[PDB]
């Protein structure tokens, strides 16, 4: 009989203290989904104050927007490549337990308070380590639902990506030329090329190796503490009413969770109107946001329970449950249903064909023989 | 790690509002009234 586990949504970790995360590897996914351990795709933030006054529209070039394959980008190939590299360099097996992306863990952290999206994830246990990623059939169903999205939503997504293009540079500012700066308005936008950081972090007794998509860095790259100079960008509709603050702080919670996962110290928003025109640009601190929301003068006491600490406790409880429940060489599924919003359901996978397909999607063959020869050496 | 667990227990017992880490929450969800807050604030004894 198949084994099913139910975790109450009210689960909160008592001691979800965060060890300071350290970037142990870095990668740059190319247009062909190939991973190279370099910082070629790392961007550098640059956005002067006076640029806002130009009233730049965020819809120039939306008709030729590019989108990568969701299945291809959901694979854990870069993380496994970095793990193989660090294993070959060290020669000893790492103590890390959980392997994941930033978006998956942001969904797992913001689930109680961002309950308007549905997702299914697959977990594969191999060599005592758990690799989690998206579920391919559900991802295909998501794409099926996606092509029914109106061109307004596509224009909004392209506006966000165009804001990211305009607020970044492909090189450090002293090494950039004028042409690389003023041609960002005509630059083609795609979701394929991106830069990532492979960072070790600690929650309670669990070491998690996260691959976080870094938008850009502050002004340079620090080889000692790479996390301290990282910066990301976001777009949000402007504010004119109380519901506007409510929606903006709901989005702020999600973005703060995303930055807290990868240790981004600073957050930047660009404000857009109904015409997708950039209105304001604001900056916030990751450690100041929990205090900033509670100390607002318009609504001093919205709730007596702090949502951010509860979110962190729920994240820690989810991490601990994932580590404890999953055993060795087991393939499991974690699907969150927004129709229920009551508990998390964890299921086992018994179909050998589907299990092997999920493993191949997560663990490529070449990494399998690399771990096989590592085991033979062991 | 178990020693740090005991340390966190005594820390939450003595101090409630600890920066960067969750406070001890009762079964009803309210924070545990640490002895540090027993003498500070309106609920504190020093104000009266």
């Amino acid at each position: 009989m198949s084994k099913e586990k139910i975790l109450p949504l009210a689960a909160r970790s008592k001691k979800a203290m965060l060890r300071q995360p350290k970037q142990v590897a870095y990668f740059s996914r190319d247009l062909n989904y190939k991973t190279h351990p370099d910082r070629s795709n790392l961007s550098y933030y640059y956005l002067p104050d006076g640029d806002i006054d130009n009233s730049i529209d965020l819809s120039v070039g939306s008709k030729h927007f590019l989108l990568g394959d969701s299945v291809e980008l959901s694979k854990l190939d870069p993380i496994l490549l970095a793990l193989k590299e660090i294993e070959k360099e060290s020669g000893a097996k790492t103590k890390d337990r959980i392997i994941t992306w930033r978006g998956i863990m942001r969904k797992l952290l913001t689930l109680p308070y961002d309950s308007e999206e549905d997702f299914v994830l697959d977990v594969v246990s191999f060599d005592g380590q758990l690799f989690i990623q998206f579920n391919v059939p559900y991802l295909k169903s998501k794409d099926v639902q996606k092509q029914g999205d109106t061109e307004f939503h596509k224009k909004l997504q392209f506006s966000g990506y165009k804001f990211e293009k305009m607020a970044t540079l492909p090189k450090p500012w002293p090494e950039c030329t004028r042409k690389e700066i003023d041609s960002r308005a005509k630059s083609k936008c795609n979701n394929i090329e991106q830069y990532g950081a492979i960072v070790r972090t600690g929650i309670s007794r669990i070491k998690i190796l996260i691959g976080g998509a870094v938008a850009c860095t502050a002004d340079y790259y620090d080889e000692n503490d790479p996390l301290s100079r990282y910066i990301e960008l976001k777009t949000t509709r402007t504010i004119n009413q109380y519901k506007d603050m409510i929606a903006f702080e709901k989005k702020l919670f999600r973005t703060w969770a995303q930055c807290f996962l990868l240790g981004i110290p600073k957050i930047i928003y660009g404000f857009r109107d109904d015409n997708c025109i950039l209105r304001t640009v604001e900056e916030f601190s990751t450690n100041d946001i929990p205090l900033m929301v509670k100390n607002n003068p318009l609504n001093e006491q919205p709730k007596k329970e702090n949502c951010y600490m509860s979110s962190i406790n729920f994240y820690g409880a989810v991490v601990e449950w994932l580590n404890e429940s999953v055993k060795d060489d087991q393939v499991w599924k974690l699907s969150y249903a927004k129709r229920n919003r009551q508990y998390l359901v964890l299921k086992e996978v018994t179909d050998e064909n589907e299990k092997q397909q999920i493993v191949d999607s997560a663990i490529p063959a070449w990494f399998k023989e690399w771990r096989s020869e590592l085991r033979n050496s062991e | 790690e178990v020693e740090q667990l005991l340390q966190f227990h005594v820390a939450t017992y003595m101090d409630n509002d600890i920066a960067g880490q969750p406070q001890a929450l009762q079964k009803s969800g309210r924070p545990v009234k640490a002895i540090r807050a027993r003498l500070k604030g309106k609920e504190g004894r020093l104000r009266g």
Binding site: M17, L18, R19, Q20 | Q4, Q7, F8, G20, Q21
Partner: peptide, 22 residues
């Protein structure tokens, strides 16, 4: 430098633990 010729490690507060950097 101390008053012993030994370099003084820097103590950093991670969570509630203290880590030394020699």
């Amino acid at each position: 430098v101390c008053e012993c010729g030994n370099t003084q490690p820097v103590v950093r507060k991670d969570g509630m633990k203290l880590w030394g950097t020699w």
